Amino acid sequence: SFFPDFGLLLYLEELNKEELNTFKLFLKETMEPEHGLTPWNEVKKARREDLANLMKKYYPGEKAWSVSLKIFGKMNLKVLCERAKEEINWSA
Amino acid sequence: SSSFFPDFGLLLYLEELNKEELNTFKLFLKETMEPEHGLTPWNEVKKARREDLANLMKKYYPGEKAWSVSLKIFGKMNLKVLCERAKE
């Protein structure tokens, strides 16, 4: 159980302003069918340390690992999608 | 239903990847298939073209399995990039 305590915080800290917001949105979407928009208020304004503990709360154990890995996946696809969107059509 | 990712989604994103990104994708796939398929189909994947690669995932991971595995691989791929960034 190394991921919830130390791993997530390091990579989260590596994210810039745009990337961090992107993370929260996908998390919001992920928590939606299970918790609704109830914790979204907390998550949206949450700091990285608070965000890490929040995920430990709603997703304890390897649950944090499963959702986080998937969120990082969607984040990569977003960048790729945004990149492909300009190649497919040069008019954005 | 839905999640027709190998047929419509996956094929596009693989094409967005460069050579190194495609290889990195294959490596992570190898890691995932190992406890399930071993190194038996790894030979096929290693040499696989992007179009071939999509059908292979359609084969070994039918239904929404292809989307789930792909999403996790892209996650590790992103973590790799982030790791390399902090290391620099």
Q: Which of residues 64-83 of B touch A (CB under 8 A)?
A: 70-79, 82-83
Q: Which residues are CB-contacts of B62 (< 8 A; sequence separation ≥ 6)?
A: none
Chain B CB within 8 Å of residue A85 CB: no
Overall domain count for chain B: 1
B42-72 b/e (C-beta count within 10 Å ≥ 16 → b): beebeebebeebbebbbebbeeeebbebbbb
**Can you tell me the distance from the alpha carbon of B18 to that of A22, in angstroms, rounded to the nearest whole number?**
24
Q: Is A83 in Cβ contact with B13 (below 8 Å)? A: no
Q: How crowded is the C-beta side of A85, counted as CA atoms within 13 Å?
A: 7
Would you tell me the crossing angle of helices B19-37 and B50-60 to the nearest 10 degrees?
20
Q: Which residue of A has its CA nearest to B17?
A: A80
Give the CATH number, domain containing residue A26. Answer: 1.10.533.10
For residues B44 and B56, the answer to whether their CB atoms sit within 8 Å is: yes
Q: What is the DSSP string of A23-59?
A: HHHHHHHHHHHHHTTTTHHHHHH--HHHHHHHHHHHS
Chain A CB within 8 Å of residue B12 CB: yes
For residues A19 and A82, the answer to whether their CB atoms sit within 8 Å is: no
Look-up of token digits 């990082």: A72
For residues B42 and B58, the answer to whether their CB atoms sit within 8 Å is: no
Domain membership of residue A5 as a residue range: 1-92
Reading the block at residue A74, the tokens are: 């969607």
Continuous segment of H or E residues that includes residue B26: helix B19-37
